[PDB]
Design a protein around this nucleic acid. Structure first.
Ligand code: MG
Ligand code: MG
Ligand code: MG
Ligand code: MG
Ligand code: MG
Ligand code: MG
Ligand code: MG
Ligand code: MG
Ligand code: MG
Ligand code: MG
Ligand code: MG
Ligand code: MG
Ligand code: MG
Ligand code: MG
Ligand code: MG
Ligand code: MG
Ligand code: MG
Ligand code: MG
Ligand code: MG
Ligand code: MG
Ligand code: MG
Ligand code: MG
Ligand code: MG
Ligand code: MG
Ligand code: MG
Ligand code: MG
Ligand code: MG
Ligand code: MG
Ligand code: MG
Ligand code: MG
Ligand code: MG
Ligand code: MG
Ligand code: MG
Ligand code: MG
Ligand code: MG
Ligand code: MG
Ligand code: MG
Ligand code: MG
Ligand code: MG
Ligand code: MG
Ligand code: MG
Ligand code: MG
Ligand code: MG
Ligand code: MG
Ligand code: MG
Ligand code: MG
Ligand code: MG
Ligand code: MG
Ligand code: MG
Ligand code: MG
Ligand code: MG
Ligand code: MG
Ligand code: MG
Ligand code: MG
Ligand code: MG
Ligand code: MG
Ligand code: MG
Ligand code: MG
Ligand code: MG
Ligand code: MG
Ligand code: MG
Ligand code: MG
Ligand code: MG
Ligand code: MG
Ligand code: MG
Ligand code: MG
Ligand code: MG
Ligand code: MG
Ligand code: MG
Ligand code: MG
Ligand code: MG
Ligand code: MG
Ligand code: MG
Ligand code: MG
Ligand code: MG
Ligand code: MG
Ligand code: MG
Ligand code: MG
Ligand code: MG
Ligand code: MG
Ligand code: MG
Ligand code: MG
Ligand code: MG
Ligand code: MG
Ligand code: MG
Ligand code: MG
Ligand code: MG
Ligand code: MG
Ligand code: MG
Ligand code: MG
Ligand code: MG
Ligand code: MG
Ligand code: MG
Ligand code: MG
Ligand code: MG
Ligand code: MG
Ligand code: MG
Ligand code: MG
Ligand code: MG
Ligand code: MG
Ligand code: MG
Ligand code: MG
Ligand code: MG
Ligand code: MG
Ligand code: MG
Ligand code: MG
Ligand code: MG
Ligand code: MG
Ligand code: MG
Ligand code: MG
Ligand code: MG
Ligand code: MG
Ligand code: MG
Ligand code: MG
Ligand code: MG
Ligand code: MG
Ligand code: MG
Ligand code: MG
Ligand code: MG
Ligand code: MG
Ligand code: MG
Lengths: 64, 96, 51, 84
RNA sequence: CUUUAAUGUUUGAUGUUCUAACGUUGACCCGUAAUCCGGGUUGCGGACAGUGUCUGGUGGGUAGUUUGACUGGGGCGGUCUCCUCCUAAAGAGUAACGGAGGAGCACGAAGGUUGGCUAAUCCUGGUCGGACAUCAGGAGGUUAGUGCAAUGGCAUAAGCCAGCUUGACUGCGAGCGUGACGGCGCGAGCAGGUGCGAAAGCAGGUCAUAGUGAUCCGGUGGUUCUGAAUGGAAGGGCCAUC
RNA sequence: GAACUCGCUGUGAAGAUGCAGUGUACCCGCGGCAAGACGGAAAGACCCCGUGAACCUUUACUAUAGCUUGACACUGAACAU
RNA sequence: GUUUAUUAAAAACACAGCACUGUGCAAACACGAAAGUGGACGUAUACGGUGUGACGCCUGCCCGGUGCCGGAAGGUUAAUU
RNA sequence: AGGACCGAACCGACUAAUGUUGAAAAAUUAGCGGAUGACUUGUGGCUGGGGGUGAAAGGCCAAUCAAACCGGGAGAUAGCU
RNA sequence: UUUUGUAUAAUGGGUCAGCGACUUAUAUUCUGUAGCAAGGUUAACCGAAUAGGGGAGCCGAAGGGAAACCGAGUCUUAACU
């Protein structure tokens, strides 16, 4: 039968032009008074996935 | 996705966004696919009959891709700034 | 331990605020400072309020 | 068989290493903003075209070659960047 | 507005009496050749008892399960995250139930800037005053002091006193360091708006290195986003925070 | 598993018929004895491990039969507080 | 007297006797989704549960903990409205 | 008269020897306990598996019992050999 | 066979003959090979047709942003060297 997508990985990764993936940074939901503004400002944009992690992401999203 | 017991990558990262229902009834049209209709008038109904866009598309957008070499007429569609120049240089017209 | 979180609310009516801590036992007065408001882009007066 | 397994110890813990030291040595060509040495306190002092961070990190402020020298009435150690 | 009695209205409850629902494992007649059952007559109870739906308490009577790892075998005892020194072999890193100590905070000034200062300890003289309080001189040279452990720093002081203040600021960021990763760290320069200084200039917290908790699920405020026939709204997204 | 199936001292996956050095020993039965072949028999029952099992206990967790409380229905009429 | 048919016959179980407690008869209690049945064609000198164990001399002090029995002025408290 | 006494049939199973690929998947030989009673025996009947029955040993329920046997879910699962 | 390590006195095999363990279906990515190429290819079904019809669909030729939206650019910001 057809492969089934890991539905929780699809809510966290998106594919880009050359075939990479983008994600949202961690550590910005919670406990924000004690963090510096320089630190929180650098966690706001989006980021790419590293080389060692790509194999685990690709297996979870076969139709992406 | 199993990593031995350590919290895996697709769960220690946060979720983001929402999915838009309007984006699924929208399409884009190239310049090179613009003389493939019949009649010389480019329109939402004539693009479906030429198998260029889907049956439930309600909005369309002509972008700058390829070449157009004949005078054509566009009604009811949106056109980019750079595609409006290439159509008018060939001797075309754009109407709302 | 004993310091507890508070917020400073802008007096320009833009709803913008900062956050900090304060021990109420030794300094029961209200804190008041001048800070940059990015909505109107001016230094105005901020005043204390609860979380 | 009889067995005696002793008592316990009240030592046993440490903290993580922090990779201090010299990153670029004398005569190396560096770009502006490069880190030259990491330290606690100023075992080295900042010279020409070199800045000092909030944790006493020394970094380049131009493009050139690293240079070590000793100067002053206290025989102290300085790093400067000589323009490339 | 309150203070009292009833008229009238509203029911809410606690009591006696009644019989017509309902109970009868009291008596008698019939189906009937029958200690079941049904019908009839009478007596005794009587809106109680009992049953259905919903609900608070109790419930090893029964059921499904859980009850960590390290470890000179297991159990008992000790430990599990973070910071500083030694082991560690003069770059970085480096183990043991190896040898010694600390943290789970504090501060609207103990932060910024401008101007100004320099310690411990001992000796001699001096009212109470003494081994040690405050005063004057000499010798000494950081043996002192750092909000809190240890190490590395500090006189141009980072140590000590004053005036004015909110840069403990918003959007970014060339280039580097350290990690398997998630992440953590240093940073000149650019745009907007501030403070101190006559100016050159300094300022994106504190001499530095501990003072900490992912994602999910929700709560509060703001929003040129979305809004299942259409106009709204509910709910969702984005930004700040718990 | 196959055998043309000796002793001693050493060696060696650390207690040798089979390895090294050496000593002794013509070929084959029959009656006896149990020191060795870490002799035969039963994938150690003791001990530890596996995010294995079963049954027992309780003021471990979460449920539930039973027992118990009230509201409404079956369910009506006077009268006084 | 009884007991581990097939490694344990005993000081273990039972026993006559003693005490506590429940039960007014459509009895408590047990087997049953229920209808029914046993208790019993019995009726407190009767029936069920628990402990102790012929007989003789006896059975002391503690109600703070846990459990049970009684009470109902006050506080907290469900469905319902 | 008697859960009285000694002792055969009958019902048991305290000690020793043998046997242990047995004559026998629990026996034989020599002694042993009860033997008118809570005794022993023939034929038929009733109680069914989280169930029965138990003078109680976790004993017995067709050489099987801390949950019988047969068929099915079923090629349960097995980071282990 | 398993191990740091086995002549091992660690495991398995009395011998012979026969049988006895990486498969099948569907989806997805990479490599070789063939066809056609800014295009490639049809499913169910029709049809006596392994032919022929059927282009419903699918992949590719455009990306950025949570999204509205813009578009060889787009997002971030009051604005970017
Ligand atoms: Mg990106
Ligand atoms: Mg948020
Ligand atoms: Mg864990
Ligand atoms: Mg089409
Ligand atoms: Mg010994
Ligand atoms: Mg260290
Ligand atoms: Mg009657
Ligand atoms: Mg009556
Ligand atoms: Mg009732
Ligand atoms: Mg209830
Ligand atoms: Mg239990
Ligand atoms: Mg319980
Ligand atoms: Mg139970
Ligand atoms: Mg159970
Ligand atoms: Mg249980
Ligand atoms: Mg289970
Ligand atoms: Mg263990
Ligand atoms: Mg040992
Ligand atoms: Mg050992
Ligand atoms: Mg141990
Ligand atoms: Mg312990
Ligand atoms: Mg070193
Ligand atoms: Mg070295
Ligand atoms: Mg190494
Ligand atoms: Mg160590
Ligand atoms: Mg300070
Ligand atoms: Mg100064
Ligand atoms: Mg200062
Ligand atoms: Mg000025
Ligand atoms: Mg400090
Ligand atoms: Mg250090
Ligand atoms: Mg949750
Ligand atoms: Mg609408
Ligand atoms: Mg809204
Ligand atoms: Mg020999
Ligand atoms: Mg010999
Ligand atoms: Mg040896
Ligand atoms: Mg041998
Ligand atoms: Mg030997
Ligand atoms: Mg031999
Ligand atoms: Mg030989
Ligand atoms: Mg040999
Ligand atoms: Mg030899
Ligand atoms: Mg040899
Ligand atoms: Mg030899
Ligand atoms: Mg030899
Ligand atoms: Mg030789
Ligand atoms: Mg013989
Ligand atoms: Mg012989
Ligand atoms: Mg013999
Ligand atoms: Mg013999
Ligand atoms: Mg022998
Ligand atoms: Mg031998
Ligand atoms: Mg052996
Ligand atoms: Mg074994
Ligand atoms: Mg075993
Ligand atoms: Mg055991
Ligand atoms: Mg495990
Ligand atoms: Mg007897
Ligand atoms: Mg008997
Ligand atoms: Mg017994
Ligand atoms: Mg026996
Ligand atoms: Mg026997
Ligand atoms: Mg006996
Ligand atoms: Mg016996
Ligand atoms: Mg009955
Ligand atoms: Mg009866
Ligand atoms: Mg007793
Ligand atoms: Mg007596
Ligand atoms: Mg007593
Ligand atoms: Mg009591
Ligand atoms: Mg009492
Ligand atoms: Mg009571
Ligand atoms: Mg007799
Ligand atoms: Mg006798
Ligand atoms: Mg006799
Ligand atoms: Mg018997
Ligand atoms: Mg016997
Ligand atoms: Mg004898
Ligand atoms: Mg015999
Ligand atoms: Mg006999
Ligand atoms: Mg005899
Ligand atoms: Mg006899
Ligand atoms: Mg007798
Ligand atoms: Mg018989
Ligand atoms: Mg008979
Ligand atoms: Mg019979
Ligand atoms: Mg029968
Ligand atoms: Mg029967
Ligand atoms: Mg039966
Ligand atoms: Mg069963
Ligand atoms: Mg049953
Ligand atoms: Mg019996
Ligand atoms: Mg039983
Ligand atoms: Mg027992
Ligand atoms: Mg059978
Ligand atoms: Mg049997
Ligand atoms: Mg079972
Ligand atoms: Mg049983
Ligand atoms: Mg059978
Ligand atoms: Mg079975
Ligand atoms: Mg079965
Ligand atoms: Mg199944
Ligand atoms: Mg199988
Ligand atoms: Mg199997
Ligand atoms: Mg294996
Ligand atoms: Mg094995
Ligand atoms: Mg093995
Ligand atoms: Mg070994
Ligand atoms: Mg060898
Ligand atoms: Mg060999
Ligand atoms: Mg061998
Ligand atoms: Mg051998
Ligand atoms: Mg062995
Ligand atoms: Mg072997
Ligand atoms: Mg082994
Ligand atoms: Mg083997
Ligand atoms: Mg083998
Ligand atoms: Mg063998
Ligand atoms: Mg063969
Ligand atoms: Mg090709």
């Amino acid at each position: 039968p057809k492969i089934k997508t890991v539905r929780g990985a699809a809510k966290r990764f998106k594919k880009t032009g050359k075939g990479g993936f983008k994600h949202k940074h961690a550590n910005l939901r919670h406990i924000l008074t004690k963090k510096a503004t320089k630190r929180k400002r650098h966690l706001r944009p989006k980021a790419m996935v590293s080389k060692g992690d790509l194999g685990l992401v690709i297996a979870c999203l076969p139709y992406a | 996705g199993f990593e031995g017991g350590q919290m895996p990558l697709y769960r220690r990262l946060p979720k983001f966004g929402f999915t838009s229902r309007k984006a699924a009834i929208t399409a884009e049209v190239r310049l090179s696919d613009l003389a493939k209709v019949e009649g010389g008038v480019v329109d939402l109904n004539t693009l479906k009959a030429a198998n260029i866009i889907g049956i439930q598309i309600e909005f369309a957008k002509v972008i700058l891709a390829g070449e157009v070499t004949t005078p054509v007429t566009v009604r009811g569609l949106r056109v980019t700034k750079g595609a409006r120049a290439a159509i008018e240089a060939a001797g075309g017209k754009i109407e709302e | 331990g004993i310091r507890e979180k508070i917020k400073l609310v802008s007096s320009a009516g833009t709803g913008h605020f900062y956050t900090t801590t304060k021990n109420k036992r030794t300094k029961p007065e209200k804190l008041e400072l001048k800070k940059f408001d990015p909505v109107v882009r001016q230094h105005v007066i901020y005043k204390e309020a609860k979380i | 068989a009889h067995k005696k397994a002793g008592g316990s110890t009240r030592n046993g813990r440490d903290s993580e290493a922090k990779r201090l030291g010299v990153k670029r040595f004398g005569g190396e060509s560096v770009l502006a903003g490069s880190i030259i040495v990491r330290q606690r306190g100023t075992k080295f002092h900042a010279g020409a075209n070199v800045g000092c961070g909030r944790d006493h990190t020394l970094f380049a402020k131009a493009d050139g070659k690293v240079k070590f020298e000793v100067k002053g009435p206290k025989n102290r150690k300085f790093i400067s960047i000589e323009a490339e």
